[PDB]
From Swiss-Prot:
This is Metallo-beta-lactamase L1 type 3. Its EC number is 3.5.2.6. One of its GO terms (molecular function) is beta-lactamase activity. It comes from Stenotrophomonas maltophilia (Pseudomonas maltophilia). It is found in: Periplasm. It catalyses: a beta-lactam + H2O = a substituted beta-amino acid. Unstable below pH 8, unless zinc is present.
Amino acid sequence: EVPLPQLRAYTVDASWLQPMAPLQIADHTWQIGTEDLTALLVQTPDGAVLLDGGMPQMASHLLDNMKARGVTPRDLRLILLSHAHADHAGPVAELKRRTGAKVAANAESAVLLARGGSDDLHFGDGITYPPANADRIVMDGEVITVGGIVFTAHFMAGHTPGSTAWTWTDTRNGKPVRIAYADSLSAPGYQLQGNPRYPHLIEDYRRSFATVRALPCDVLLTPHPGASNWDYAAGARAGAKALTCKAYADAAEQKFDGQLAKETAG
Ligand SMILES: [Zn+2]
């Protein structure tokens, strides 16, 4: 009659794919992704770190922005991830091939990255990307230092088992700026209660709200800028309206509680 459906590509709003020039956040820290996907370059006298890469088709754009910053493929030492979904870890395999970068991630993020986002607890095989291997496994609270920028991992399981907030201290005007790159605290279409694939999902999210609320956090950034009220297209005012970590956690918790109630009603 009636063939099986074609494969459906993971398609997203144009703004998520809209290239932007590097936007400086602090002395060593730049947004180099797109208007609606964060990809943070931290540049040090001992090499560079990338936190997230956005979608798979962003690899070349990231490399161009790195070059604009004076960061060559060899200079890129480390890729860190918020979580290993296609829209944040998309280009990681390609980046590894084209640069000196090695990936550090927790065990959950590493296994999900190694399967290219397939067999996702919630999306199944709906949202996949090229698989990549982690080079270093990090534990909760573990520190990775590059050129005296100290990144601390704070596990915030929920959006994915391996979701992580990365914190570090940069400077702006000779004063310290405690940057918190907090992962998503959404649960887009997730079954929250009694989920056989994630039995403690709710407890994990609750704990993650508390973790996020308590982060060292002069400046919050999030994988989608809109989540923390960043506007990467607003130039000098990009971070003006940004939420605190406390407000971001509170909003997320409130939305989660609403989603729980809707699920019970559904
Ligand atoms: Zn995600």
